Amino acid sequence: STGSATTTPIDSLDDAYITPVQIGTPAQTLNLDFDTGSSDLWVFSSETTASEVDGQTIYTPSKSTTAKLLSGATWSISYGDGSSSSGDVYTDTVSVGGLTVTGQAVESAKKVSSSFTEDSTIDGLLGLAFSTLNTVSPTQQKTFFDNAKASLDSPVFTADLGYHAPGTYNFGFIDTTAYTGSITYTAVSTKQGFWEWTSTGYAVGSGTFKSTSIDGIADTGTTLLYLPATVVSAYWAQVSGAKSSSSVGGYVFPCSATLPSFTFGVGSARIVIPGDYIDFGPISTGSSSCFGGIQSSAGIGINIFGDVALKAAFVVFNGATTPTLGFASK
Secondary structure, X not given: OOEEEEEEEOXXXXXXXXXXXXXXXXXXXXXXXXXXXXXXXXXXXXXXXXXXXXXXXXXXXXXXXXXXXXXXXXXXXXXXOXXXXXXXXXXXXXXXOOEEEEEEEEEEEEEEOHHHHOXXXXXXXXXXXXXXXXXOEOOOOOOHHHHHHHHOOOOEEEEEOOOOOOEEEEEOOOOOOOOOOOOEEXXXXXXXXXXXEEEEEEEEOOOOOEEEEEEEEEXXXXXXXXXXXXXXXXXXXXXXXXXXXXXXXXXXXXXXXXXXXXXXXXXXXXXXXXXXXXXXXXXXXXXXXXXXXXXXXXXXXXXXXXXXXXXXXXXXXXXXXXXXXXXXXX
């Protein structure tokens, strides 16, 4: 089997991407944030504290003839941005782009933190990291991809995120029309539960490539590119007036600037992020200070190849017995 679904930016900055997901019988379609940095499929629901729902579409398990309470199971997750959610668990039929999994754990939110409430466009998350990170207790649950894997034509999914435009998540096949050149595959460590890999270096603009190992994670659920402070300083030094602002929370730059590109290495291959992809717009409405899309990971503990980086590539998440990542230009 295969599936193919379009993923759409939630706003004009590509702050996140939403993908429609069919849950239950008859289908209830919710727009979920596909997140290769976590491993829970959780949704706003009829169980979510009413004051914490503000415009989201909710899953109502009592209206699904295939929903079953997973008795005793609870979940609770905290994300790198400080947001969180928790609740109980149903199993139900979940379909993405024509690919159906029966008995998928659908984690129903009883509580969500303010940032989720405040984002009316995201109805939940669909985790695509390794199932060892799933938070369901006392019986850990499998991701949608893990459940689908055996049925797929090939044990892979691909992320093809758009810049200020829709893109595609495919399951079970590699669309050879969706990228240019060849796909370069690179090793993955699953030891932390992530799609963790080592970039071979970087360049800023037309500058020379610096060969240096950068371990990090391919994370579709993180907006920006978070790299070591040395790398980030080298990038922003090429932008007149750019500075790290403690009060704003990262590098800002004059909105009048033209940003240089940023290249990252995948083996001997190179992925070029155009400068425009690094512009996240005014820090507040009407400001002439703009927020940068490349930020330091120094306070995180891990480097994160988030959407800024991934949207410059066609990315293969290869879930074979030994997982690997593939990157192609597009």
